[PDB]
Amino acid sequence: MKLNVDGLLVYFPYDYIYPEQFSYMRELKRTLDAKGHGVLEMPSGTGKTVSLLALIMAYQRAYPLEVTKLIYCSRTVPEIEKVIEELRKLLNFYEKQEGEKLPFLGLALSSRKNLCIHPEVTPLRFGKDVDGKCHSLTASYVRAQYQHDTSLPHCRFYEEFDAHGREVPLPAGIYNLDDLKALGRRQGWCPYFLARYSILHANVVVYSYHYLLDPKIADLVSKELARKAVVVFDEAHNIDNVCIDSMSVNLTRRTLDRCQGNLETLQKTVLRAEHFLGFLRRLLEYVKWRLRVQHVVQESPPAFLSGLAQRVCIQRKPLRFCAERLRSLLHTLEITDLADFSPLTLLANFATLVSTYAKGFTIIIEPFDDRTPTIANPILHFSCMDASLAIKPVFERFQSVIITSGTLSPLDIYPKILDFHPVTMATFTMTLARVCLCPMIIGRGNDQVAISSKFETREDIAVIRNYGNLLLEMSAVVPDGIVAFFTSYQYMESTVASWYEQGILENIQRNKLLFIETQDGAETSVALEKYQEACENGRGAILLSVARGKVSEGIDFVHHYGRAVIMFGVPYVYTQSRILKARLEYLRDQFQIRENDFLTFDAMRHAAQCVGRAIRGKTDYGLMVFADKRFARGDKRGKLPRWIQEHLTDANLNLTVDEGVQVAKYFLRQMAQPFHR
Template identity: 85%
Template sequence: CEWVNDCVVERLGGFQDRRRHDIKYRPFTIVDQICWLVINVWRSRLVPSELNPGSGQQILKNVCLWSSSEAVPGSIRTAEHFVGFLRRFLEYLKSRLRVQHVVQESAPQFLKDIFDKVCIDRKPLRFCAERLQSLLRTLEISDISDFSAVTLISNFATLVSTYSQGFTIIIEPFEDRTPTIANPVLHFSCMDPSIAIKPVFQRFQSVVITSGTLSPVDIYPRILDFRPVTMASFTMTLARTCLCPLIVGRGNDQVALSSKFETREDFAVIRNYGNLLLEMSAVVPDGIVAFFTSYVYMENIVASWYEQGILENIQRNKLIFIETQDAAETSMALEKYQEACENGRGAILLSVARGKVSEGIDFVHHFGRAVIMFGVPYVYTQSRILKARLEYLRDQFQIRENDFLTFDAMRHAAQCVGRAIRGKTDYGLMIFADKRYARADKRGKLPRWIQEHINDGSLNLTVDEAVQLSKHFLRQMAQPFSQVDQLGLSLLTLEQLESPEMLKKIAQIAHQT
């Protein structure tokens, strides 16, 4: 093929040598993956029957992909041309990453630059993902994970050429932590969340969106760009008060508790956070889950607790396990945490909001008798992707930046503390350790089933006051309570469901909400 230059020929030679000496060699780099495709495309042209008996050439020359009714452009119709096309696109991306300053542009601007510099049109880019799948099937690739880099490039090409609005391309030449070391990254970020749910609305006539953390509900129609027929927020029907939300805003020394940037390094705030966890570990049975706003913040606080001797005192009451960014370590920590709760030793799991534990793990019954949220989990506001998204929401949906940031933070806070209540027979403490939770604008964005249990006596508490209220709540929960006590309240019998009076009562309650 004429498009294979000397550099690629040299790479092919080295690639074949590695294959000859190491039968288990896998093409890890994207250039190796493209070279592997070149070798097998040549083989398919010479001996098609060996690769795919009876159908090799037929699939290679297929004009129309199975999932699309539109013909594949002629520039990528044959396998050789498609692999060459991918290489041209890859070289263009490499040239774009050689920048010394941050670049932000829309998808149409990106496509125009591609056409001006390497004469790649939009239409063949749209077919890259499907065309690569077709080629891998033709070459009978069983493990497509070996070609993850090529797949990523092809998917990016398809997405950037499909959506003209709602996406932004940001090229960052350096990381914030290492501004002198070149490590370019190209971000292709979705600014419009309605793009993801739009196919659902188009396919189904009636759609029900429900969750325990959809609060405030009025912002979702604006963000997802739809008109709701019915919108309501419900409480939890409970036979007894099985959740106890507390807002701890002060330490015992009256120092205000907050995770704001100005007070993150405050020795007194860190000490009071440690005292809160220490006191709770002495009165709460079994498991306690604590959430921090970020991994860096958690590491700094834990290190300070260790220096102050607070961790040593806590471990006299319960074992301590920490969530990390490593999936294997986190899985092991969860396993040992549950084991410590099962055998009666008790345990504390230190986790991070927006992490694996906060979004996918249920701490039922004794695995989560208390959840402590240290600070308000605001997202990192200096992120260029976040700034671009906030600008898009402001321009397209008239959503103010502060409103969205507060909504997002309170949604994640509710998701974290909601780990403690996983059913009507469960119970647990929800402790918000930050004075800002006592503000009306913050509390108003919590789910209604949490708001209704927050009263004036639960606001701006000290550590000692929170401990006393926790003791009282846990003492109440320790009293005998059977399923019979729930009948007619949180549970209904068949006779009650068929009763006209009960149906009328349910209708009245639904109308009030």
């Protein structure tokens, strides 16, 4: 229906609008009228996207001049496809409610592997070689030699798109990635090239974070698209981590071995301009000098260039030219493929980063390995320390950057973690006919001994027995699915080993099946599949995993999957490896951020992010427990999102295992009754 905002009417596919959605629309309209950025926090993954798109379309219709381009950067490809299909549903609703079409174009962007039609590159699973093969098949030299019609195998989609697809536009009709591929294959055009041509003449477009956070591709994909545009980062609770990883590179023995292997081939090709031919040869030994040095750590972000200009005595000026040399010398050398060549490009990227970015970074060398620390492994990584650098080139190029996710409880730390000027300070807590979640914090066990996962008490037998008892008698009350997140893989395996040693793991087995998530991707996928198939029937299952793992955020536990989420201790990141402590010191001496406050913020952010995936949809319900007394302290509860705070009553903040089980039983019994709409 038509929702009447204070100064506009907006069509919405769903007749009924929840108060949270209405308040969200009010706040977003206020921000758009304020011409400023903002941060938002909503508890529903679904229903936020439709409201966002509806308000965006209404604002564009009312003010075509104020807003011209929309960006909906998300985390992965499933989010892209679901937002595209939701936009398609919205457009279908608008067509069926209005009767006339509109000249609005919406496309989804992804990598070369996602959008390609050649059968010679699809079967392979090399993401770093598909771009190189695509460049080799079609490039400037390919276009130049196509005039003579050279008899050689090459891609021909571009050779038809440049002569037929650069004239006919697509004013109307939003196209999904599969639709783009179908159009490209029926018209003999490359989907990527037609997307590149049609982004200029487009209304909305969605892609991943890496196309804006990484400077090496943001300029190519967004240079003069729109001076005044709206960008939104949905599910951006970990925006700082990806921003840090944007300017983070790693070096090891394999990388330098590959570089020394391929430099001989490069020299052989060259001997068949001179400013870099001799420049590239002696760069390897400077970094291999650290390989032979048996030292713990060396830190010198400003003095790294000074040290480089002593052993080899090279000026700082030529370092910045690597970026412009990459696009020039390589295309003249006619590289056959990017295989066995990416480390050379990453070395140039590292050199450019250290030459240009040296104010808020640090160089760390880590000669440590898991289970084999000191054999041969000096690991050099240019770890980023400030999250503002990856977010600067978007705040100054846009007007209403919005950070929204399901876990953004502290709105006073994000504006200081990254340079930001919020004007919203807005949070929304969902309301339903009944409370769909039962958050509670379990402290001491039945023996009145705290189950805190403190480092000095990790090896304690009493706390391990209490954790096992909690998981056992909890598994008898919540049916068809329990998700348990541990602090780390080492703690998880040490706890399950102790459970196996005692006669307690058998009692858990006879209630629900035990599934352990490991680092292997195929093993994790098959374990998830069998966990789902066990949850489908009445057998029940337990999913044991780690809070900081690829399975914590890779999947969503929709209703009847994972009715209970258990947090075994506060998930604290490893303070070792001398990487976290550098960031802690940088935030201490730069943003005046307390180290304890930042650690608690990260721990609670991860805990809330991994515990809020059990509530997807109004009808969905789930049980949330926190098996640590440290959660009971106010400084950690206050970091939980507002949609969980009001449901966490003061009655259950330190209750034992038995009373937690009783509360879970009452909640589950009272949540099985029919409800209304």
